[PDB]
Amino acid sequence: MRVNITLECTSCKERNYLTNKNKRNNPDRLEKQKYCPRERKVTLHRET
Amino acid sequence: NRLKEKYIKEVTPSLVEKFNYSSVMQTPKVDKIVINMGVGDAVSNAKNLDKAVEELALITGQKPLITKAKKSIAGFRLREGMPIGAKVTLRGERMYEFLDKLVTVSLPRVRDFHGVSKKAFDGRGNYTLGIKEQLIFPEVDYDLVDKVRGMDIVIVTTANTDEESRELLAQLGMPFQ
Amino acid sequence: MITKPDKNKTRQKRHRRVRNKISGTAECPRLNIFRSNKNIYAQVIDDVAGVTLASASALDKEISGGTKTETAAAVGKLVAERAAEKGIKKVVFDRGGYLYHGRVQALAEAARENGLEF
Amino acid sequence: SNGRDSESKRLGAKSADGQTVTGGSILYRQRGTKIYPGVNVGIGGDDTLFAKVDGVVRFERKGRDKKQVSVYPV
Amino acid sequence: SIYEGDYYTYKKKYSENQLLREKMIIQQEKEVKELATFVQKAKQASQTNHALKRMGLERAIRLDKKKKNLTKRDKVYKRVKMDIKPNREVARTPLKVENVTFHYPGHPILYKDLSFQISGKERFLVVGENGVGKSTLLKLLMGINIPDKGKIIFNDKTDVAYYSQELEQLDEEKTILENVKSDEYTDWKLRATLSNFLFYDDDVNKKVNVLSPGEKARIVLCKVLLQKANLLILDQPTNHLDPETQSIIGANFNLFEGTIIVVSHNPSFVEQIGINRMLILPSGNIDNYSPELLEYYSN
Amino acid sequence: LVPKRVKHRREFRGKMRGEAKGGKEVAFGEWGLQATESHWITNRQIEAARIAMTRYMKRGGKVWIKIFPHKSYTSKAIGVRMGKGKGAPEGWVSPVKRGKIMFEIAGVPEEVAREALRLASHKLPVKTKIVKRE
Amino acid sequence: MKQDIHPNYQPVVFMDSTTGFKFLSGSTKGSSETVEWEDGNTYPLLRVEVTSDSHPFYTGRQKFTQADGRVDRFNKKYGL
RNA sequence: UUCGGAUUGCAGGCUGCAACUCGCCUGCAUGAAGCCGGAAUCGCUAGUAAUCGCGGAUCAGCACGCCGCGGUGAAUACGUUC
RNA sequence: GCGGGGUGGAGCAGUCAGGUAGCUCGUCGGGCUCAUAACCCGAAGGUCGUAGGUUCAAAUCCUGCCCCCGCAACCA
RNA sequence: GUGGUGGCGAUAGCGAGAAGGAUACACCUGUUCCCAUGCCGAACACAGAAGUUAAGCUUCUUAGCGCCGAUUGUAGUGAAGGGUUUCCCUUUGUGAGAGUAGGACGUCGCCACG
RNA sequence: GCGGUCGCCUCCUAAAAGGUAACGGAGGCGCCCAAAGGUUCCCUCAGAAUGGUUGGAAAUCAUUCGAAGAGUGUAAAGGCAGAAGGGAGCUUGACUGCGAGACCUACAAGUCGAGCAGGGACGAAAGUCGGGCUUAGUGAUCCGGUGGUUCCGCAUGGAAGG
RNA sequence: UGAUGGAGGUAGAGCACUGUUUGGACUAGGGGCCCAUCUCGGGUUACCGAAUUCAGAUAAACUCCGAAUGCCAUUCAUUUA
Numbered sequence A: 001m002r003v004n005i006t007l008e009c010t011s012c013k014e015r016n017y018l019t020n021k022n023k024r025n026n027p028d029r030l031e032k033q034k035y036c037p038r039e040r041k042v043t044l045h046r047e048t
Numbered sequence B: 001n002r003l004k005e006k007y008i009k010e011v012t013p014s015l016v017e018k019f020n021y022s023s024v025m026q027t028p029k030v031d032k033i034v035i036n037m038g039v040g041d042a043v044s045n046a047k048n049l050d051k052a053v054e055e056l057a058l059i060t061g062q063k064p065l066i067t068k069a070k071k072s073i074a075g076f077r078l079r080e081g082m083p084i085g086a087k088v089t090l091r092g093e094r095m096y097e098f099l100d101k102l103v104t105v106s107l108p109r110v111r112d113f114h115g116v117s118k119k120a121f122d123g124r125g126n127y128t129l130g131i132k133e134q135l136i137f138p139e140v141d142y143d144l145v146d147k148v149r150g151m152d153i154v155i156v157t158t159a160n161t162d163e164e165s166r167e168l169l170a171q172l173g174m175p176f177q
Numbered sequence C: 001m002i003t004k005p006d007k008n009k010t011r012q013k014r015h016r017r018v019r020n021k022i023s024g025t026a027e028c029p030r031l032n033i034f035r036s037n038k039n040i041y042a043q044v045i046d047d048v049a050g051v052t053l054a055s056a057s058a059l060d061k062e063i064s065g066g067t068k069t070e071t072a073a074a075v076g077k078l079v080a081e082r083a084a085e086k087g088i089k090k091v092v093f094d095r096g097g098y099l100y101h102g103r104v105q106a107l108a109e110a111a112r113e114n115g116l117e118f
Numbered sequence D: 001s002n003g004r005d006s007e008s009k010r011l012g013a014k015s016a017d018g019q020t021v022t023g024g025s026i027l028y029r030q031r032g033t034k035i036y037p038g039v040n041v042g043i044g045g046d047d048t049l050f051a052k053v054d055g056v057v058r059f060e061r062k063g064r065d066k067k068q069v070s071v072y073p074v
Numbered sequence E: 001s002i003y004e005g006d007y008y009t010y011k012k013k014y015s016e017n018q019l020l021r022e023k024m025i026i027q028q029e030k031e032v033k034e035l036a037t038f039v040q041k042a043k044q045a046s047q048t049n050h051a052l053k054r055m056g057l058e059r060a061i062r063l064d065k066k067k068k069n070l071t072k073r074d075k076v077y078k079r080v081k082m083d084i085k086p087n088r089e090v091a092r093t094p095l096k097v098e099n100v101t102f103h104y105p106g107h108p109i110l111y112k113d114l115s116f117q118i119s120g121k122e123r124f125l126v127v128g129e130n131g132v133g134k135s136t137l138l139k140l141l142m143g144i145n146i147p148d149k150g151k152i153i154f155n156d157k158t159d160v161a162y163y164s165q166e167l168e169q170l171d172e173e174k175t176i177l178e179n180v181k182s183d184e185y186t187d188w189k190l191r192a193t194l195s196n197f198l199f200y201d202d203d204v205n206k207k208v209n210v211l212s213p214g215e216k217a218r219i220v221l222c223k224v225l226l227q228k229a230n231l232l233i234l235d236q237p238t239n240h241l242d243p244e245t246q247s248i249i250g251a252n253f254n255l256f257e258g259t260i261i262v263v264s265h266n267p268s269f270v271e272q273i274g275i276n277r278m279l280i281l282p283s284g285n286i287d288n289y290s291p292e293l294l295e296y297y298s299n
Numbered sequence F: 001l002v003p004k005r006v007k008h009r010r011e012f013r014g015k016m017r018g019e020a021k022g023g024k025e026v027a028f029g030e031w032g033l034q035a036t037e038s039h040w041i042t043n044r045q046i047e048a049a050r051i052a053m054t055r056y057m058k059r060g061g062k063v064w065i066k067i068f069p070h071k072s073y074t075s076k077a078i079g080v081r082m083g084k085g086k087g088a089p090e091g092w093v094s095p096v097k098r099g100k101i102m103f104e105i106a107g108v109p110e111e112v113a114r115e116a117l118r119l120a121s122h123k124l125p126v127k128t129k130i131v132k133r134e
Numbered sequence G: 001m002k003q004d005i006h007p008n009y010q011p012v013v014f015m016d017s018t019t020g021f022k023f024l025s026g027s028t029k030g031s032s033e034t035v036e037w038e039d040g041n042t043y044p045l046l047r048v049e050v051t052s053d054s055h056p057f058y059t060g061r062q063k064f065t066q067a068d069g070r071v072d073r074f075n076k077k078y079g080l
Numbered sequence H: 001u002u003c004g005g006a007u008u009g010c011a012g013g014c015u016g017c018a019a020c021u022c023g024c025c026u027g028c029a030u031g032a033a034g035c036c037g038g039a040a041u042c043g044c045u046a047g048u049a050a051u052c053g054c055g056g057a058u059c060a061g062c063a064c065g066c067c068g069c070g071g072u073g074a075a076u077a078c079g080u081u082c
Numbered sequence I: 001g002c003g004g005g006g007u008g009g010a011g012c013a014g015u016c017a018g019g020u021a022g023c024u025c026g027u028c029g030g031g032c033u034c035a036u037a038a039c040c041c042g043a044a045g046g047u048c049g050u051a052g053g054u055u056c057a058a059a060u061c062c063u064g065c066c067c068c069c070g071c072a073a074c075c076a
Numbered sequence J: 001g002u003g004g005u006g007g008c009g010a011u012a013g014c015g016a017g018a019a020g021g022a023u024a025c026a027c028c029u030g031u032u033c034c035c036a037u038g039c040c041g042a043a044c045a046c047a048g049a050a051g052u053u054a055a056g057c058u059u060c061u062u063a064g065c066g067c068c069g070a071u072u073g074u075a076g077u078g079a080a081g082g083g084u085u086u087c088c089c090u091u092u093g094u095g096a097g098a099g100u101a102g103g104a105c106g107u108c109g110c111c112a113c114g
Numbered sequence K: 001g002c003g004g005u006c007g008c009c010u011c012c013u014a015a016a017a018g019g020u021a022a023c024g025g026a027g028g029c030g031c032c033c034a035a036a037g038g039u040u041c042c043c044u045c046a047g048a049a050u051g052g053u054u055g056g057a058a059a060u061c062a063u064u065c066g067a068a069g070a071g072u073g074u075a076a077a078g079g080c081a082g083a084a085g086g087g088a089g090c091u092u093g094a095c096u097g098c099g100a101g102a103c104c105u106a107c108a109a110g111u112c113g114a115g116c117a118g119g120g121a122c123g124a125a126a127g128u129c130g131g132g133c134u135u136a137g138u139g140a141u142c143c144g145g146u147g148g149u150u151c152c153g154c155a156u157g158g159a160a161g162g
Numbered sequence L: 001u002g003a004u005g006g007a008g009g010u011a012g013a014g015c016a017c018u019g020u021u022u023g024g025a026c027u028a029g030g031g032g033c034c035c036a037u038c039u040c041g042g043g044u045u046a047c048c049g050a051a052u053u054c055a056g057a058u059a060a061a062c063u064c065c066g067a068a069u070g071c072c073a074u075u076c077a078u079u080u081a
């Protein structure tokens, strides 16, 4: 089951990115180091 | 190293003379020994492959590489990439030691051993011995074996012709039939 | 019967792919490295003109020698200074299809230290 | 049951050989690299050949059996 | 869902609701089949029968609207299936315990010169109360505890399977499949049995650390089942199990064709197994099983 | 004659214009039947001509059928209006263009060959003539 | 050669028990008994009852009697 | 299994003109099924059953069968419903 | 062209909702009977129509194909 | 001459045969070193210079294959017309593929050691 | 009328730019992938012959031949063996604000895009990276949900609601 | 309209790929016949024959090739608007 997901910056809680993932292949919340435009630096974003 | 010593001392001059080699570089030599262990039973239970790998490692002294099925085959209940079959590659000193042990100890212990075949050649000068059963190698321990299995040992040499390979292998010691 | 592939041929197969994205200009020449079992050779080339601006190697007789790695360092220093004399500072380093690990890496570091910017 | 077909994608050459084009002009629309990007020419994500800089478009033959596009500024 | 009353009232109310729901789905299916049956009759009629063809399309529209409002029957939760069989056969003397004394260093002796002998295909109950040595005795047989005195002999024909009381046989760090991995079982064989224990598909890749106590209990039981031993040392097996799984466990053990050394404070579970001999603690008493178990409990 | 397999169930009728691309000379047999006009030839016509030729030859000698009916053609039943897709395949044909050597024969005297080829021609729908090997 | 993945390997001497013919070769098995060897070096020793020299095939002379034919058996039994 | 003694190889003994079709017996060699037996079924109320040997008639040779003999030696019979 | 079906000798389950091939009758053999029937006890008989895919795993899901059945193949 | 390194459509290739290592390149010896093989110092990496042109590589011969390929003719066809018009023909311009004559066992540069 | 069809992608029709109809001839899509993305390094296939325990046409192994006859998640076409195919290491560029100029086009849309800035991944460096060999995998507005917001706030401060 | 340069795979042609396909040669191999059956080894049909090879065809959805035209463009040329 592949679903659209939102990656939110952990630092400022800003829903910066939209992506998608297969729940079965990745049961746990995804986490990626992405650039947060609000904070203007690379931060850890975790699916919401 | 004994087999290597025997090669360089006796075999190399003998082959040079027999085949009138202009330069010593022409001398055929054993390049590598590839021992292959085909285990289709891994499909039924991977523990058969595990024990085969363990026995092979004990025999060879090197951890074997576990080959995988390049193509799925339904006839054998085989799936592509399944870890069926293992092999070990021996070169240099380990190659010579294993061949020497095979000639001296392993081969005689074969039941009613009348020698090895003399037609099992690729046609280029490389030989392959199909061992029917283990327990001929002293490291197998004759009891741990829950399932008896064989193997296929491939002697690859720089001989262009099967005749040179046979003579070289004979001089190194090979009980042909 | 078994054929051992020519190591130089395999090197060149890799080297073509490297050259697909590394090329030498008059103002940014190509630093090409050739590694032999005995020696190592470096050239500074302008592919556009197809002329070697500078050259050095273990046979210059100005390299006192030693371990092949140390000879590579001497070659790097010598080629860098010769290129500087001819007015070259920047270059693009072609590893000749080799692995940027040993003698070639030593030569590259020597060139960097002795003045070639890359 | 037949009767389906996609919209034509208007592929082909969009600039003539010897024509002067502004930088970034699309020169050739293609599926795959039917023609390769040459001097001052880039290839887009969908294989489209465009001019990097202003110049004259030239379709040469890349070797024995391949074509190529270059843009030569004047 | 929250009901007012007791467990039976919940069962009564629940059973009725699923019954009344089931009847609703039956009638919705009949109407759909009826329309479907008419739609097919029109579909295969001659193209020259215009009116029937017309009515067929009109009913095709109703059929579509029906199939889109047709309640799905909830899949009834599947119950555990256990088939425990011994690889080998029991002997007349599976286990010999003779003059066994044991004490935990610094504590009173639990039993002195304990001697019993099991018969084979016997239901042996180790009765007692809390903190009396029941689990210690079972640990003694397996080898966890070395007897202070005496001997414990297992016949060479006896294979033993141990179910510990506190679920100490699972690696919390590993997954369900990794825990059950055995040299004697292939992958699909493991999955099939785990499916018999209600672990479906990627439920077997879950870490044991996140499972509930009840789900962990099934994994331990599965390990016991996969041994195919002829002697079962079970220490409170029904603990942590839902009432439905308990009855399944007891019924299957009753049919087990092997020796069972069991401990259980659950009166229902022991009744299903049909105990033969009970060993009372701390007062060592090898006795024939009967409702006299209550007499020992009273005393 | 019918192909064992076909890439496509249905195919364009096509167009016949000019001389045949190849096979305009007798290759195997001593004599051959050359088409002087272009026309479709059905497997039925090929078979009829072949049977006539063999029967007159008394099975003495060899016969080659140079042409083969690769192409398929469809049709629509009576009472079917235009439209609603192409018709179901009906028969097989070989588009034969003038100059094609449809049949060859060998191992027989000239007069027997000429008479056998004459019978075959009358079975075929195209005007033909006899051509001798070179 | 990678470390900590291969089974243990050590040089070991071999003697033919039937003859005593001696040779040095590596092995995975370990022999409690150890013997010395020219160059004054000691290694574990694996006594071998059947080796190349021992086995009849390598020597060229076969121990077995090849049995007796029935004709000769009959002649012997009945003195004919 | 030191139970088992089938099957099989070799080598012997005998009787007889003759042991292959096709005898018994012995030595070495091997060690089969078989772990107390489904539906049902047989004998027996005492020196009986059960169990153990011995003789003999036929008979050149050939019995686990038959006739007979002796050794040890029970359990049970409530009762006539089936 | 529209549907329905291919599982032991026959008739059916099991499918939906993937983990395990059963049920009834019948057949073979043995019992019981004077004999037959009925009855009692054993045993056999299918890799799920076939060929490919999904899956750790297919009678089960997907694709095609071959068979069997019913219907239709033209209306003023 | 040899080694690097390039440009030009293989006319630069392939096959076959022959000669050479002065240097150079090579095989070649080893695994202590950085470094490595889903096993193997075979590879890659590193150290070294005993032996050999055997192979690779360079040079040379070879038209067997591959490659290039004129001219002529023809098919097709633009244009203008004609005919008995599912097709065919004329004038005019263009003109292949195929088959061939032949060409070709490369050439034009730069660097270093000779 | 019945049957079929309705949007999108690929091929032929399509007449060597592009475009081009038919209830013309063939197939696909309503996804998938946390790597099957990025980068650095490395590697080359399918089959055939010969030899070889289980093992058989065919499992695994070796030598040789083999230029693509394989593979490229998914239809077809185009393209790719200087890989776009295959393996490993590290990573998240499957980035943010844009965007000269182009293609396509009635509009709405659709497509490509150097380059600039911010801050990064890989690599020694050059440099590559704004998803995947390319081309389908999608739906206007209205209305509503959720998060953020230095915006507004019906006398003013809030709020309500935007 | 001429000149020049280009993009593209149609007509034609071709078989280098993929389909369809004919005859010859040879045969892996499959067939039934008998001997030998432990169905084992022959000996057979000008028995049937894969693949290979030779020769010969064929194609909208084949291409080693490939026009005439048309098309795009040129600070070009002539005429024109």
Ligand SMILES: [K+]
Binding pocket: F121, F122, F123, F124, F125, F126, F127, F128
């Ligand atoms: K005619």
Ligand SMILES: [K+]
Binding pocket: H019, H022, H023
């Ligand atoms: K007898």
Ligand SMILES: [K+]
Binding pocket: H037
């Ligand atoms: K009995």
Ligand SMILES: [K+]
Binding pocket: H059
């Ligand atoms: K007698």
Ligand SMILES: [K+]
Binding pocket: none
């Ligand atoms: K080396």
Ligand SMILES: [K+]
Binding pocket: J053, J055
């Ligand atoms: K050489």
Ligand SMILES: [K+]
Binding pocket: J105
């Ligand atoms: K040539």
Ligand SMILES: [K+]
Binding pocket: none
């Ligand atoms: K990667």
Ligand SMILES: [K+]
Binding pocket: L015
């Ligand atoms: K062809």
Ligand SMILES: [K+]
Binding pocket: none
């Ligand atoms: K065409």
Ligand SMILES: [Mg+2]
Binding pocket: D006, D007, D008, D009
């Ligand atoms: Mg299209």
Ligand SMILES: [Mg+2]
Binding pocket: D045, D046
């Ligand atoms: Mg893209």
Ligand SMILES: [Mg+2]
Binding pocket: E134, E135, E136, E165
């Ligand atoms: Mg306890």
Ligand SMILES: [Mg+2]
Binding pocket: H035
């Ligand atoms: Mg017993």
Ligand SMILES: [Mg+2]
Binding pocket: none
């Ligand atoms: Mg009486």
Ligand SMILES: [Mg+2]
Binding pocket: none
């Ligand atoms: Mg008596």
